[PDB]
């Protein structure tokens, strides 16, 4: 894939969880099969691009709940879609605090 997803919104649902919802239009990559999405998150206090943790989600989903986060902590959040060939560009990068 050469088009990445776009993050529509991020919202904390608890002290340890953040909901994110994205859009991805299959035809933007000629309808190439996408196997899933990678969702990246790291504490906003880090500017180390190596400090992103990753969740893997299936290709049908347009939202995800990130969990096991720290209370009252800001996170940088971005994502890619992927397939057997490889990965997209990163999305926009949202900042979102847990409760």
């Amino acid at each position: 894939p050469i088009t990445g997803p776009h993050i529509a919104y991020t919202e904390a649902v608890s002290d340890t969880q953040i909901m994110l919802k994205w859009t991805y239009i299959p035809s933007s990559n000629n309808n190439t099969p996408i196997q899933g999405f990678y969702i990246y998150y790291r504490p906003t206090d880090s500017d180390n691009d190596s400090d992103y943790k990753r969740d893997v989600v299936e290709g049908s989903k347009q939202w995800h709940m990130i969990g096991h986060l720290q209370p009252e902590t800001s996170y940088d959040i971005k994502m890619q879609c992927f397939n057997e060939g490889g990965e997209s560009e990163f999305s926009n990068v949202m900042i979102c605090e847990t409760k």
């Binding site: 991020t10 906003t44 206090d45 500017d47 800001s74 990163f90 926009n92 990068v93 900042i95 605090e97």
Partner: protein
Amino acid sequence: TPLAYKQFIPNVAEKTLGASGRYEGKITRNSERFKELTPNYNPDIIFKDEENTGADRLMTQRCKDKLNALAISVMNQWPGVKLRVTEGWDEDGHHSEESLHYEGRAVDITTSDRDRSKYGMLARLAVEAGFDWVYYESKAHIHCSVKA
């Protein structure tokens, strides 16, 4: 005196005439107003740039002026510590509708050491640097804005 969490100075709403004044509309990358924005390349300011686009550097002339003054006072206050910008002008879209971040008129800031015990004083230093509104917006950063 230092600000505490949730406090703002002047103690009126951001978009009031006495503070930063009204929203004028989101400035997008492809727009004519985007040309009023130029990158702040001050070597005494750290720009987070999690976007890998240089967006956080982009801001109005007035925002630059006050930010640059603050960069000096920060280094004076705590030797070895610098001003850090987490958000300048934004296109990622996580800010509220009518956020001054969408116009290059607001910055979220920390100290370089992320020592939250310094943030209340950092907010005071931003007021003294001449930001039109300064808000201890989050436990994690101070929000500073300027008039159009």
